[PDB]
From Swiss-Prot:
GO molecular-function terms, A-Z: endonuclease activity, active with either ribo- or deoxyribonucleic acids and producing 3'-phosphomonoesters; metal ion binding; nucleic acid binding
UniProt keyword ATP-binding present: no
Protein's recorded name: Thermonuclease
Enzyme Commission identifier(s): 3.1.31.1
Keyword entries, A-Z: Calcium, Endonuclease, Hydrolase, Metal-binding, Nuclease, Secreted, Signal, Zymogen
Superkingdom, natural source: Bacteria
Class in the EC hierarchy, top level: hydrolase
Source lineage: Bacteria, Bacillati, Bacillota, Bacilli, Bacillales
One Gene Ontology cellular component annotation held by this UniProt entry: extracellular region
Cofactor (UniProt): Ca(2+)
Organism (species): Staphylococcus aureus (strain MW2)
Length: 130
């Protein structure tokens, strides 16, 4: 897998973000994570504030497509998003602000890594795991 440059256009919520990718606006759905809904589940707004702050404060944003399908049915890019080298998908799970979701169409490169972060948050009874 390889990281490609991107520019934050707009944070949308925990599991979605709008980026300028290859010079065109595009909406991305973070791979392997399930964040609470804000439109308003519990920790829904926390998850959203988390990704917004992480993405807006980042100097560099990068998108990393997995080896499976790259877009969902709604035209959203399916990727791991990095902010200054740190994966937003992982940070979310680690902070207990998202659960690891089912593998989708062969996109599972980082499934174990997120599985680990999630076990740790659970053990720490962090947020959603409170």
């Amino acid at each position: 897998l390889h990281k490609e440059p991107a520019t934050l256009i707009k944070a949308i919520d925990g599991d979605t973000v709008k980026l300028m990718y290859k010079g065109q606006p595009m909406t991305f759905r973070l791979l392997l994570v399930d964040t609470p809904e804000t439109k308003v589940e519990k920790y829904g707004p926390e998850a959203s504030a988390f990704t917004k702050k992480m993405q807006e404060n980042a100097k560099k944003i990068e998108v990393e497509f997995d080896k499976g399908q790259r877009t969902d049915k709604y035209g959203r890019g399916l990727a791991y998003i990095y902010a200054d080298g740190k994966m937003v998908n992982e940070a979310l799970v680690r902070q207990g602000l998202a659960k690891v979701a089912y593998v989708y169409k062969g996109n599972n490169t980082h499934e174990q890594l997120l599985r680990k972060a999630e076990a740790q948050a659970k053990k720490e009874k962090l947020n959603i795991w409170s």
